[model samples]
Target: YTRVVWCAVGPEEQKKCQQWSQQSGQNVTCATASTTDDCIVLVLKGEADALNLDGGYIYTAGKCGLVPVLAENRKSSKHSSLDCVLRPTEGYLAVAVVKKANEGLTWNSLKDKKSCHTAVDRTAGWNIPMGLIVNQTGSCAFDEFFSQSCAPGADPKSRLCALCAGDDQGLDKCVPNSKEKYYGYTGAFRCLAEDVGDVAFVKNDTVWENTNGESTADWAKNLKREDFRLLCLDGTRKPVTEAQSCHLAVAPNHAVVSRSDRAAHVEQVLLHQQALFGKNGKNCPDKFCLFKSETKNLLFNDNTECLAKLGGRPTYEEYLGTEYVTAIANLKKCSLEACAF
Candidate 1:
């Protein structure tokens, strides 16, 4: 009768986790941390049972002996007849987006440009794009690659933090948590939308959700989808709808990670929890929807339909895929070298 303890990454997430714990009839509980890495550490130390992580963070946790439990499955556009919990993850597109008005800018033109990233160790936001850059340039000095950027988790005094506007009061500048205005997917996209950054490293859905009145938030309501373009690796720009061909990489879906010793228990508990709180679950909507949050993504992405079962109980390398794992390894090598200086 052990309760599953979820490690929340920030104050907002902590509040949401507390609500989830209450709604779960005490089947689950909350443990709070300041950032994703801290939450990962909590799980490693046995202070927490699990946390949902991006593929980039998944690599970090996996390298530390944690294992994937279940993956976040979003609504399928093409496989609606299949059950979300049974369908294999299609992953998501990681793309570079730029304003249409900033004509002539392409992947090749990104050098020395101002940029926005969701955070330091996110998939679409950091690992994919930065890894590609490092591979192309053969240098680990990515901090100087961009003239300025809002890459959260970098040293606040560095150029990597130059474009970050932080919270409304302008405090917590470069903090990896949502408290920073240019912190996550929406934040990084908003940074580009506001012209604070020349390009944003985010996903195709971020553009669709934020533009053309799809999002009612103050900054997004007036945005038109036609005003943006995606940067393709071929040194060309294409419409956001062309992301299938224009994306930098396909990032693995975010998944729950727990220490290997606790993996099975975490999986069993989560499957049961989602049965009550997942999309279409009996207690959802009127009670609590674990897959949704008033402030967008919290414990899981709001678009999540359920935590799908992973076939083969794949090792982290298998789950992340060989090429992606290799790419991350190359990027980490650079990171390690950069840190050594």
Candidate 2:
């Protein structure tokens, strides 16, 4: 009978085998037995040859005693090698293993699958403009049109004419002359939409006059009132004639402080040149007087002293903050033209 002795090549080989066994998820054991001579002997198992063992000189026969084998013909392939064996026995496992290998290969083959890809960075709010238009003074005839149209089957033409005539809404409406020509008049040049309402007016002896020579002197003497006409940027006329009664002007005074606690002062500048000059044709000296009082405080009284106190050239932030105070002052001086800038 032939006797087969199995032994580990060395500690290194034994460690390698242990590592491989752990990685393979297989429980591996070396068969051991005691010889008749009381010496320890290991038995060679059928699977021992699967782990081909070789001495530095030649192929050595040993049982699979936890010794790692390096097969010459059947080299150790990747985990993919088990796919064939696992295909039928465990189809899912084979498919998973094959998929993993393929995915890795595919990723590696990709041209852009490298760490060199640069990330994108973005910035916003560049070149954005400041300040937007909110509202403007104006009116429309459409309101009258609707009111007449809805009045209990009202005669379209008659209702429209009545609506236009009764438009104490201060909206500028045309008055026809004996020659069948219509003339337009807005009570004043500074009219805002809200100012339009029932008010008395004196008809001037002009081509646009229609009222029977009635004088508004009695109404004007008792209470102060001024008419205003408004035209929007688009040339559309506001329907309502805006009237300001008992107008009182309020002046603005501003002071700005810097990080150093120094104060800078700027005088409010009057913006409504038209209003200041009474271009609206309504002789309301009281309105002009109020405006003058408000604007008088706005002109710089001590600009030199103020700027001297706030030392150093102001930064844009500081300048803007200071300008805001000035703007408020300007607004108080003239609401109509303060935002023109």
Candidate 3:
């Protein structure tokens, strides 16, 4: 009997799942799901044990009674814990970015501004920054705060889509679904570059990647990190490299979730397998590494150093900070139905 059934989405992920199942040296197996949403269904119905999800989906899974078992620590992250059990991931900085020339745009003075958002309900783009704003003000009428916003999940007819750009698929322009042109980390950053919005709500590295030309897109090829600065809540501007000290809330890392009934066994299987196929494991030298999911990171994010324990079965509000939980709750009032409020 297997210890857990890991639901990996798509063929590439399922293949990695099967490899992990075999390489784990534990009683584990792979269960395939066509989509991440379906994976949640499998966990709820007891057909599978776990799957890794971004924080937004983590909230959805929590509402469905699933608990986070392990958090994925990105290898490239500032916090280095490739195999630390029962500890939280170091977390990425969520910040508001503005070109250096965008004067007088502090966190407190953002009202009636034109804004770019990664997507509705995303930890960095929506919850952290706006959550801080709405919690202090007790208002859900964010539409009034920003005169125009290219927030991806908003009703297209509204001003929310006024400044959005395009997606890889041309039809994604101004649409609310994933098809929305400027709906993700990179897209939202690009929205700011195209001169569509005054500020971009996104992760710190997003500013670095696009500005430093790692983006290679025509719009960002000449952009430099020095040209942008973080708009601090205290009205101070810091360079992108200083995010560790002067950033907005740090987001909870992506985590794997399972039914409470199977969480312990899931951890056991993962720990045992990680000892063999983990970043520092002996078997990893053979290229059968679980963290080497370069193109098939459907079950987990690629370059995930390890699956570290969550320490305890923390509630959604506890795992994600209470302030963050409150923040996202407030935005739910204004978010499009697609944010699944």
Candidate 4:
């Protein structure tokens, strides 16, 4: 029986003892009477086959048992004075054991530790997910109530036309006077309907001039500017020269004053002619005719036949008014005849 005295050794001697046990093929078993000792004594009977020590003490034991031990010192140094002794029962004990057995232990060392929590509880719901609802198809036909009515020259097949022709009272009503500013085409109509109370129809043909400004030679030959005359409900016909005479009627209280440019045709063409010609041709190509002709048609309809000559889409500005009319007439559930112009 070799007398193996396992004492309270410091960090250096404990390491040598563990290494010697491994080399000699002797099994070393350690038992501690008191937890105060930094090192535990392993009573080796024969050539030590293995060495067993506290998992936390490996760091003090150096290169013993393949990896370092992780021991913590107690607060005081007396017999049984181990108030802060290494606790094997703590949550960190398992982590310490894994770290001692392996050389490179990272946060990803454990298999199921990271996969425990991912998506939050709030996100679990119906198939709609956890965000504000959106109309994915963009159809949103239900929103037609808040939109403008179809203007005189709008597409007959458009939703505005359908709303204009619909008999549903809630379909296309006009906004009240105070809310007229809010009652525009597209988005504005939707916004106004949410907060406004009194709903009414928006008039599109106040002045009765269908031609905005373009020459209507295609529709009618020998077109007099007076052809843009609008007939009021009072049986009075007026020429669309100024806003007062142009007679572009909005809803009764929702009337919007018009600012006509007498030289709008010449000015607009001169301003945009260079850009248009740079891309297409010199004499304001048929592509620009949509904007030129439609604007004219909307203003006075002096030349109704010119519409067939318009060849392209309206610009954003020109299309905006049309969109507004569609919103009020079609989406807002207002009849074209009932809306105040």
Top-lDDT structure, candidate number: 1
lDDT, candidate 1, 234-309, per-residue tens: 9999998899889999989999999999998999999988889889888998898898774367888877889998
Q: Candidate 3: where is the Cα deviation over 4 Å? A: 1-42, 46-49, 75-82, 85-88, 136-138, 172-181, 209-221, 265-303, 329-341
TM-score of each: 0.96, 0.14, 0.73, 0.18
- Stretches of candidate 1 exceeding 4 Å from the true structure: 336-341
- Misplaced by over 4 Å in model 2 are 1-159, 164-175, 178-216, 219-231, 234-341
C-alpha lDDT score of every prediction, in listed order: 0.89, 0.19, 0.73, 0.23
Model 4 superposed RMSD (Cα):
42.3
Per-residue lDDT of model 4, residues 1-341, tens digit only: 22222321222234443443343333322222222112222212212212222221221122121221111121223333322222211111000011112233322222211110001110101001111111222343422332433221124364322223211343232211011222212112122123221111112221122223322324322333443332232324434343233222221111001111212232232223223422233433543221122322111121211111111322212322342333333322311232111
**Pairs in steric clash, model 3:** 112-145
lDDT of 2 by residue, 1-341 (tens): 02112222223234433433343233332222111011112212232222211121010111112221111111123444442212111100000000111223221122211110000000000000000011111222222312221111123254323323322453323222101111111221001112221111111111012112222332222222222222222323222222111111111111121112111111111112112321231322433221111111111111101111112343322322443334333322321321111
* Winner by TM-score: 1
Output the worst ten-in-a-row residue range by lDDT, candidate 2.
Answer: 120-129
Could you give me the TM-score of model 4 versus the true structure?
0.18
The better-scoring model by TM-score among 2 and 3 is 3
Better of 3 and 4 by lDDT: 3
Output the lDDT of residue 241, model 3: 85
Per-residue lDDT for 240-291 in model 3, tens only? Answer: 8888877888888878888888888888878887788787877986957877
Native-referenced Cα lDDT, model 4: 0.23
